[PDB]
Amino acid sequence: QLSPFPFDL
Amino acid sequence: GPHSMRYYETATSRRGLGEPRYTSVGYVDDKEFVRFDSDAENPRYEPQVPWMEQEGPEYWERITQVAKGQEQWFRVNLRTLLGYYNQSAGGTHTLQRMYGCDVGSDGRLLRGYEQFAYDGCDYIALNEDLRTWTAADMAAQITRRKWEQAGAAEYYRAYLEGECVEWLHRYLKN
Numbered sequence: 001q002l003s004p005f006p007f008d009l
Numbered sequence: 010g011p012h013s014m015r016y017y018e019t020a021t022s023r024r025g026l027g028e029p030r031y032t033s034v035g036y037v038d039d040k041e042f043v044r045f046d047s048d049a050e051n052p053r054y055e056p057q058v059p060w061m062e063q064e065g066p067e068y069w070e071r072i073t074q075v076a077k078g079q080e081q082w083f084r085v086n087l088r089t090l091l092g093y094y095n096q097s098a099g100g101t102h103t104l105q106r107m108y109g110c111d112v113g114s115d116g117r118l119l120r121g122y123e124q125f126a127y128d129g130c131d132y133i134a135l136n137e138d139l140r141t142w143t144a145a146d147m148a149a150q151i152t153r154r155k156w157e158q159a160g161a162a163e164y165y166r167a168y169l170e171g172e173c174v175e176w177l178h179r180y181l182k183n
Contacts, residue, residue: 001072001172001176002072002075003108003172005082006161007159008085008089009086009132
């Protein structure tokens with residue numbers, strides 16, 4: 001499975 | 010023995026009209042097994058090798074959903090970087106991301122990766138300790154600062170430590 005959505009830059 | 014899984018995601022803005030060109034490709038040990046392409050006739054995740062066709066239909070659907078999710082993420086953050094570097098609205102740029110896990114013989118995580126690059130330059134990367142971030146330049150420090158306050162390192166470490174290792178185990182079995 002893919003990693004969760006990353007935090008915003 | 011040792012095993013690895015890597016995912017490479019790249020989003021490239023385009024001069025003129027049109028959303029960024031997004032691509033996602035995964036590798037197991039060093040063999041491509043999955044790929045997503047936004048400029049495809051039918052944008053979706055698809056197996057690249059026979060042992061990946063044994064995944065249920067729902068598997069490829071929700072995973073393709075992440076793609077769309079990731080794609081929007083790259084769209085919004087490409088714009089954020091244009092402002093951090095004070096770049097002209099007229100130009101092409103590429104925001105990249107690589108993440109994955111290397112697993113040792115004992116089955117446990119050996120090394121985790123979570124790094125981003127902008128226009129071919131390192132921007133921010135999770136150090137091997139999976140606790141701190143390396144910020145290439147001043148713009149990256151804005152991000153790192155906000156990520157330290159939000160505990161982003163632990164967030165990503167959770168995935169690398171569990172899901173990444175577990176799914177790599179599953180893929181290798183199939």
